[PDB]
UniProtKB/Swiss-Prot annotation:
Reported cofactor(s): Mg(2+); Mn(2+)
Residues that hold RNA according to the record: 25, 27, 83, 107
Binding site for Mg(2+) 3: 22, 60, 81
Range within the parent protein: 1160 to 1324 of 1733
Domain RNase H type-1: start-end pairs: 13-159
Miscellaneous information on this protein: The reverse transcriptase is an error-prone enzyme that lacks a proof-reading function. High mutations rate is a direct consequence of this characteristic. RT also displays frequent template switching leading to high recombination rate. Recombination mostly occurs between homologous regions of the two copackaged RNA genomes. If these two RNA molecules derive from different viral strains, reverse transcription will give rise to highly recombinated proviral DNAs.
Entry protein name: Reverse transcriptase/ribonuclease H p80
UniProt-annotated binding residues for Mg(2+) 2: 22, 151
Length: 165
């Protein structure tokens, strides 16, 4: 009956997990490869290649949803460099849903299944903060390094999937 009331856009001090998520989509070998990743600053929690033709935005969505699922029952601070993802999570998703636009035949909305999955995932974490930071930062700050880590994780996930076959 609605979205998660306690969802916040700022870091919570006591969090169990501080993560970073990134999607990526490029054309490799005359084909669109995508990948998604959830990592800490120093280590990769989860990374996967995604079905061909997957957009960057959708990849972001999937990465985020994954972070949520893995964070179930715990306290999560998750950083995303995607304004699209951040917005969808905080605002657009719940509106689309409550409108009945997500389950309709209308393709005027993109990544409907991802959106639904995410809306469902938002309830898993005990306490949740989805924060947005500009990605690919020149800065040396922990969040910049986190973002770079995630980015590299996703891209590696895709490239690796391509050349293992
Ligand atoms: C091509 C650039 C702008 C691209 C935009 C989408 C981002 O979410 C991705 O992280 C990517 O690394 C940068
Ligand atoms: Mn990104
Ligand atoms: Mn990236």
């Amino acid at each position: 009956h609605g979205t998660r009331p306690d969802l916040t856009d700022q870091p919570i001090p006591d969090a169990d997990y501080t993560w970073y998520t990134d999607g990526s989509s490029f054309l490799q070998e005359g084909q669109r490869r995508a990948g998604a990743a959830v990592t800490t600053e120093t280590e990769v929690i989860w990374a996967r290649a995604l079905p061909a033709g997957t957009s960057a935005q959708r990849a972001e969505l999937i990465a985020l949803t994954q972070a949520l699922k893995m964070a179930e029952g715990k306290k999560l601070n998750v950083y995303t460099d995607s304004r699209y993802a951040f917005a969808t999570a905080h605002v657009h998703g719940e509106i689309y849903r409550r409108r009945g636009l997500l389950t309709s035949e209308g393709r005027e909305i993109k990544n409907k299944n991802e959106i639904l999955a995410l809306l469902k995932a938002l309830f898993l974490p005990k306490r949740l903060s989805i924060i947005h930071c500009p990605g690919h930062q020149k800065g040396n700050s922990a969040e910049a390094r986190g973002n770079r880590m995630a980015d590299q994780a996703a891209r590696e996930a895709a490239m690796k999937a391509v050349l293992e076959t």
